[PDB]
Amino acid sequence: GMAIRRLVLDVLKPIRGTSIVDLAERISKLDGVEGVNISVTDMDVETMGLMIIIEGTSLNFDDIRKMLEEEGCAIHSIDEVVSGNRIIEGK
Amino acid sequence: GMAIRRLVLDVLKPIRGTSIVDLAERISKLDGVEGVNISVTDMDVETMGLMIIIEGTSLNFDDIRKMLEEEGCAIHSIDEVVSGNRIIEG
Amino acid sequence: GMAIRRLVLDVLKPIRGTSIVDLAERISKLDGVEGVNISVTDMDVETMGLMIIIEGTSLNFDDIRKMLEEEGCAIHSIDEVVSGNRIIEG
Amino acid sequence: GMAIRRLVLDVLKPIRGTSIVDLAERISKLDGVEGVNISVTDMDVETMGLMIIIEGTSLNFDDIRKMLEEEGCAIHSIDEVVSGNRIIEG
Amino acid sequence: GMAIRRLVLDVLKPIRGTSIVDLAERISKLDGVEGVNISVTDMDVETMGLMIIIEGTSLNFDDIRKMLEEEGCAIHSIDEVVSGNRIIEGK
Amino acid sequence: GMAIRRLVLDVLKPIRGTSIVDLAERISKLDGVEGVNISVTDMDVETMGLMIIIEGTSLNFDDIRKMLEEEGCAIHSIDEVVSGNRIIEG
Amino acid sequence: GMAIRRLVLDVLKPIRGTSIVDLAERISKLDGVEGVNISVTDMDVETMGLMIIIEGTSLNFDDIRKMLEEEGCAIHSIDEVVSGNRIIEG
Amino acid sequence: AIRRLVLDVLKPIRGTSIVDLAERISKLDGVEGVNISVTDMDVETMGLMIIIEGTSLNFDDIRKMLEEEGCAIHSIDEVVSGNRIIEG
Amino acid sequence: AIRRLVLDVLKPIRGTSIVDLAERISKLDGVEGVNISVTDMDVETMGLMIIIEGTSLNFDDIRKMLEEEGCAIHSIDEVVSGNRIIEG
Amino acid sequence: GMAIRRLVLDVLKPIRGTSIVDLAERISKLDGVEGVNISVTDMDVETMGLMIIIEGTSLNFDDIRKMLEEEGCAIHSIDEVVSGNRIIEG
Amino acid sequence: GMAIRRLVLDVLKPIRGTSIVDLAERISKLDGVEGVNISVTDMDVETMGLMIIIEGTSLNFDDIRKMLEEEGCAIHSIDEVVSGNRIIEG
Amino acid sequence: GMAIRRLVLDVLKPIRGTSIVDLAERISKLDGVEGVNISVTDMDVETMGLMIIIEGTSLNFDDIRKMLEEEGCAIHSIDEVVSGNRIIEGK
Amino acid sequence: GMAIRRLVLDVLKPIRGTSIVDLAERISKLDGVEGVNISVTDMDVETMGLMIIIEGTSLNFDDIRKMLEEEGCAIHSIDEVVSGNRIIEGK
Amino acid sequence: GMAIRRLVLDVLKPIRGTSIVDLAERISKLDGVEGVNISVTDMDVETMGLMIIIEGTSLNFDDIRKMLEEEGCAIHSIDEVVSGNRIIEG
Amino acid sequence: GMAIRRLVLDVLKPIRGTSIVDLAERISKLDGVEGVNISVTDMDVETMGLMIIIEGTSLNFDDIRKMLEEEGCAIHSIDEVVSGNRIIEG
Amino acid sequence: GMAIRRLVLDVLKPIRGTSIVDLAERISKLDGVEGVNISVTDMDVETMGLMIIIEGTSLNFDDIRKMLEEEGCAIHSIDEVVSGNRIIEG
């Protein structure tokens, strides 16, 4: 049973601190993660709006959430999650 | 005899409780389910609007419905269902 | 001689009664039917607007129509039909 | 020599009489016809606007025209015809 | 040496006479012709505007023009012609 | 060393004289030419605006230019040229 | 272990100094880098706006950033980063 | 090294034709293809987009060659380097 | 239901030709294709491999038709049934 | 959850009784079965040697074995079985 | 209703008379014929052994047989015939 | 890090006991397993020779071995193992 | 109507005279010919055995035969001929 | 600069100690390694003959060798090595 | 017109003199040549047996033959030649 | 002008000295080299038989030969060379 396969997260980060490169790298080292895509959607003066797409096998959301908090991020919204044996897409 | 293959559900959930991650995982473990996609369509102060797409083979709607109720969800609408030997599109 | 291959029906159903899941399942069990897609296009207070796409080989329209009536549905419009040895698209 | 391969017809039909399902079936039984797609483009109070796409090999237009007349249809326009060894697009 | 491969013709035809079905069939029987596509682009009260696409190998334009005249058609414009060993598409 | 592979020419021709069909055929017979596409871009009362695309291997521009002059054509503009071991797009 | 696979950088460079050709070449010689694409997005009188796309395996961002500074460039924005065993697109 | 160069180039409206120019660039070591297209033109100068692809393209030679043929590089719009061509 | 039937069939060396036989089988409901090939022949009988493919093939009709045409089924060598054709 | 996907069985059947056509049809109607291929490998005077390939989703082997016994068949050997989310070949 | 699609004929022809090239051309011009392949399998002193493969749509065997007789050929054997909506291989 | 991806096992089983169907099913339910192929290579009077191919992500060999022992099987040989981010094949 | 598309000829040629390169070139220049493949199958002391494969559209066999005779060749056998709108392959 | 891409090693290991599963896992976790295939080629009473195929990017042979020694293995032979920008075959 | 496209030559060369590398390079620089493959088939004490495959467009056989002679080679046999608009195989 | 594209060398090396891994790495760093494959074909007590396949663009054989000599290798035979705009196979 392959559990969580894709997470699409709308994430807020302070405009500086952990760069998104270092952030992408750390997430990619978690167990089950096969790929991470972080892209900037917008930014204020002090905060950065990020879309973080994580794909893999039995992704541990708790760990991912823990890592984002530690790096000063907040999850504003879980926009999409895909779970199971194969990836299903949205309408 | 492959019965139900795809369900597209418009679902209401309390803004907190069972996270949609845990909800997606649980549904994906049901017999016949090959994939689940949960995405947030909108949210009020206290409720979350979700589109839940389930695909598989002979999906048991009663079980899925039972599971969603237990997790505090309501089905507002069954938007699409596909049944039979292969997946037909709209 | 493969007769009818695709029917696209604009159908009216009472907002409750036979759920569209049970409806899709029955239709999918008819002879020649290889797939059914039912999706909700709109809904009033008391009626549901459905697009029912049926694909298969020598689909029997009389049976399908008979089944829809029995389940409380009306065919407002046959929007598309495909017949013959292969599917041609519009 | 394969002659006529595709006909795209803009057709007028009375809103009731021969249903387009029966019409699609009868056309699909003609010699050389490999598929028919009939779709409703629009409709008045008393007439139905149809796009009839016929594909096959050495399609006999006279027979098809004869059949449409007999079923109460008029050809408003032959929008596209394809002829020869292979299908060229427009 | 394969010569003319595609002709795209803008053709005028009287609204009745030879139907475009019979016209397509005749053209398709010419030597070297592998396919014909006739589609109606517009029509007045008495004339029909047609786009005739002919593809094949060493298509004889003289024969095709002769046939169109005999069937009451006029070539308003030769919009595209392709010649040689293989088809080049326009820009 | 494959030299010129593609020429895109903006060409002026008298509205009558050598038809563009004969012109396309004559160019296609040159050494190294693999295909010619002539299309009309516009036309005045007495002159025709043509886009001539020639593709091949070691195309001889001098010959092509010579041939166009002899057939009453003028090159208004060489819009694109591609040279070398393979075709690069714009 | 595989780390950073793609970096898309929005970069500022003085309108003259290290040419973007020499800059692309220098970056392409770094360990893990398999390809660099530098394109000009816009330019003022004294500064050049560049989009630098770097792809490879375990790309070292610190090295890349150091190199850009040394060549008189500034990173305005890291627009996209991809990390892990395989390339996930946006 | 260099796989793709996209150059914005100025050339006098006459002199070396862009056909001869494309041919001579295509004969350089490592060059696999050249595409020259006219983007615009004044009364006395021609605006050209020159796309060169190949393997370990020598920019100095290409630049040297263009100068010798009376051309100026207004702008290097895109360069691609490394083991594969990465797209923009 | 039945998607593919492979039949080992005996036919008298003359009577209904295998061309007419192939045509009449191909006109049955659900049949999409027939392939008849001669495997061997005695002085008075012909050995045929008849491959029929389609959707919900009616074996009784096919069997009935073959008998009527003077044929005997020596052996049903392969049958495929269900939503897809599974190969051997 | 998905279970048995392919069974390849070496089966003995009496040379007459249930024809292999009726046998293939019966098996193809079981839950989860998407296709059956029965082919004759050899035959004695009184017994028929069959290779039965069944494919589907969560195939119930107990049901299949029960059905074969009832039809007078014996399983000589289970030559191959495939289980899980996807088909692994040998 | 597409009828005969492929004929494979074992044919005897006198070693000279109508060449097999002219014979192949003449057969290819029949209605419904899309391709002919004639190949020599063997030859005596006075007769030629030919395998003639004809493919198309609603091939008229009577015409083909008539044409072969007129050209001095005999059909020794019809080795394969394919009929219906699509081509099945042996 | 996706660890063990493919195991090819040469396995001995008593000619009766747990059928290979039930055996394939149980293995396929283990965490990370995406597919199992069991095929009979040969058989004596009392023992069955099996090739068991397991594919997945971070396959736990200890668990698989434990399950085979419990079902009365012995691993005669681990013929092939594939580990890492992608499947590499043998020469 | 595309007529003859492929000719496979078993041809005898004197071991010297017109080289097979010049012979292939000439044939390839005939109307309708899109390709020629000449390969040596065997050779005696004074004669060369050739398989000549010609493909195209409405190939003129008379012209091809005439050309071979003029170049000192004999057609021992026409092994295969394909005619019509599309290529059928042999069995 | 991609350095070593493929190593094919003929390796000797004691019949017991570190299992080849654990060995494969450990090697797969090294920097640059994308895949490992270990297969048994033969075995004596006390030693195991292994073919270890490692693929990746800038594989560090010293580390791999160090790891194999630590796990009780000996490299009998480096049978094949591939280095550079892409994988070349034998 | 594209003339000669492929030459396959069986060539004899003295075991030393012009190395086959230099020979391959010089042939590849001829007009129309797009690729050369020289491989050793066998060798005596004093002579080398080579298969030279040349591909391109309007290959000049006289030049190639001239070049081979100058480099001390003899053409034992022209095994295959391909000519025309496209490459036919044997 | 792409010159040499592939070299296949039969090479002799002392059983120890420069390992074939270090040898493959050096060669892969030469200008124009895109890939190297070194595999052991056989070995005596004191010498190793190697097949070295080098691919790239305008490979400099003199440099490669110079490098092999310096590393204690001898070229026994150049088995295959490919030159020109593309790789042609034997």
TrEMBL record, chains B, C, D, F, G, J, K, N, O, P:
InterPro entries, per database record: DUF211, MTH889-like_dom_sf
Annotated Gene3D superfamilies: MTH889-like domain
A Pfam family it matches: DUF211
Superkingdom of origin organism: Archaea
Stored PANTHER family: DUF211 DOMAIN-CONTAINING PROTEIN
Name recorded for this polypeptide: DUF211 domain-containing protein
Organism in which the protein naturally occurs: Saccharolobus solfataricus (strain ATCC 35092 / DSM 1617 / JCM 11322 / P2)
Automatic annotation (TrEMBL), chains H, I:
Name of the protein: DUF211 domain-containing protein
Pfam families reported in the protein's UniProt record: DUF211
SUPFAM superfamilies: MTH889-like (SSF160363)
InterPro entries: DUF211, MTH889-like_dom_sf
